[PDB]
C-alpha cells in the first residue's frame, strides 16, 4: 500500500509535486484507500499541522503553490469558515481548480468570502482603518490585508456564471445580493436566461 498523506510531510520536490497535485485531483473523487477511514477528508485531517508548516516557506520551487490548495480544500471539508483561516489559503491559490459544484466547494467558499469581507470592511472602517465603505464593486485589496485581495474578488465574480450554466440560479442571485453587486448584476449575464434571474432579484 501507499498513503499519499505521508508524502506530504517530506520535502524533495519532484516526488512531492506529483503527490501534492494528486491530492487535489483526488479531492473530487477518492484516492488513498488502504486505511480504515473510507473518505480522503478524514485521512488528510491529521496532516493539517504538517501542511501549514511547509506553507509558511516560499522558498519552495512550485510546491508552495499546490500546498495552499490542499489546505483550502481541507479547510472546506471541515466546514471551517475563515477570517484568516481558509481565507489566507484561498488568497494564495494560483494553481487552484473549480470542482464540486454538486457538493460543497463552490457554495462554501464564495459565500464565506463574501460575508466575511463585508463585515470585516464595515467594522474596520468605523474602527480607524485605512478602509472606508463596505466594498461593493470588485478588485478590493482591503488595505493590503488578508480579508480580500484583488484576484480573490474576481474568483467570486467567476463563480456567479458557473451557477447560472448549472442553473443553480437561486444560489447565484443570493451571492449577488450578499456581495452588494452594482457592476456585477449586468456583467454576469451574457448567456442563458437573463429574465428569470433579474426578476427574482
Curated annotation (Swiss-Prot):
Coiled coil: none annotated. Residues 122-143 are annotated as: Disordered. The modification Phosphoserine is found at residues 130, 139. It comes from the Eukaryota. Residues 131-143 have a biased composition (Low complexity). Present with 306000 molecules/cell in log phase SD medium. Acts as a regulatory subunit of the 26S proteasome which is involved in the ATP-dependent degradation of ubiquitinated proteins. Belongs to the proteasome subunit S2 family. This is 26S proteasome regulatory subunit RPN1. It comes from Saccharomyces cerevisiae (strain ATCC 204508 / S288c) (Baker's yeast). The gene is RPN1.
